[PDB]
Every structure is written in structure tokens, then in C-alpha cells.
Amino acid sequence: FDYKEQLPESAYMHQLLGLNLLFLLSQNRVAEFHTELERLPAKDIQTNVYIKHPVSLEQYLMEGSYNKVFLAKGNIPAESYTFFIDILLDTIRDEIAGCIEKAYEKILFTEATRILFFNTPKKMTDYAKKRGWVLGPNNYYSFASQQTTIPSTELAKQVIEYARQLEMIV
């Protein structure tokens, strides 16, 4: 992006650039992701494939079409886009979790396996052996939902503050 006038156009550039975008998505750095997209020129977002694919993955992931995100696995412009697809699957699982523990009531074992695209059923225990949302009640996958006293001290602080700014001379 810097020595633009002097540097000759490098056709062997978009590959690494989009691979960087994929890396940002992989480590859930959405802010930096969109900053670099903005840095990129406008046309490349819709013309090139190397960049379009990471753009497509991020767009799908923000919409919530995780099924499309997964189905995109086979669709990869160049094999270089590797190991970040894997870190991206891991991060997607983490985000699916985030959803589950922020806003659900309880997910049974079969439905947890269905929703979270875990590893083989035997390792399906994964992410409960790792995150462990206080699981266990009734069925081991009860999800243990992770969902009134006057704050007298704080109210006293604030009211005293009113009095202080009203009585001080200024």
C-alpha cells in the first residue's frame, strides 16, 4: 500500500492479501478486518476471487449463516488458504458457544450435538470438557442456564455529590 507509484503492480499480491483477511477472521479481529477492507480499493471487493472469498466468509459469519460458512470449506480459490480455515472453524465454534450461553434456556445432549458441529460423537464432550457452562444438571447437557437490594451506599455518594456541587462556592 505504500510505494504505490514506484512499485510495479504485483499480480501475486491479492493471494497474500486475502489470506491475511482470512487470518484476521480466523482470530476474530473483525475491527481490523474491516479496516483493511476499507484500505483495499472498491472494485477488488466484487471483482477478484481471492479477496471475495474471505469477504464472503465474513459477510456470512456476521449474518449468522454458519451453515453457508461451513459449506464454503470446499470453495477455496487457492490451497494456500489453509490452517486459517481450521482456526476459523475453531473460532466459529467459540462464537456459537457465545450465542448458546448468552441467550438460551437449556440444550439437551442430542440437540447440542446437532447445533454445535462438534467432532465425532465420542469427542462431542468437547467444549464442555473445555468451556464447561456448569453442565451436568439432570441430563449432562442441561446447559445449566447462565442467566432487589437498595444500593444505599452508591445513592448516598451521588446525593452527597449533588450537595457538594450545590454548596461549594463557584
* Interface positions with other proteins (CB under 8 A): 148-150, 153, 155-157, 160-164, 166-168
State in angstroms the smallest separation of the CB of 163 from other proteins: 5
State in angstroms the smallest separation of the CB of 105 from other proteins: 24
State in angstroms the smallest separation of the CB of 146 from other proteins: 24
Alpha helix ranges (H) inside the chain: 14-26, 30-39, 42-46, 49-63, 66-71, 84-102, 109-115, 152-167
Which 3 state secondary structure label does DSSP give 144? coil
| The three cell numbers locating residue 159 | 446525593
* CB closer to other proteins, 10 vs 153: 153
State in angstroms the smallest separation of the CB of 170 from other proteins: 12
Distance of alpha carbon 80 from alpha carbon 75, whole angstroms: 12
* CB closer to other proteins, 29 vs 157: 157
Which 3 state secondary structure label does DSSP give 126? coil
Q: Between the CA of residue 133 and those of 89, 107, 108, 120, 127, what are the distances in Å?
A: 20, 11, 13, 20, 9
* CB closer to other proteins, 41 vs 151: 151
State in angstroms the smallest separation of the CB of 147 from other proteins: 19
Q: Between the CA of residue 102 and those of 30, 95, 130, what are the distances in Å?
A: 20, 10, 17
Q: How far apart are the first and last CA of the chain?
A: 54
Which 3 state secondary structure label does DSSP give 35? helix
* CB closer to other proteins, 31 vs 170: 170
* CB closer to other proteins, 103 vs 168: 168
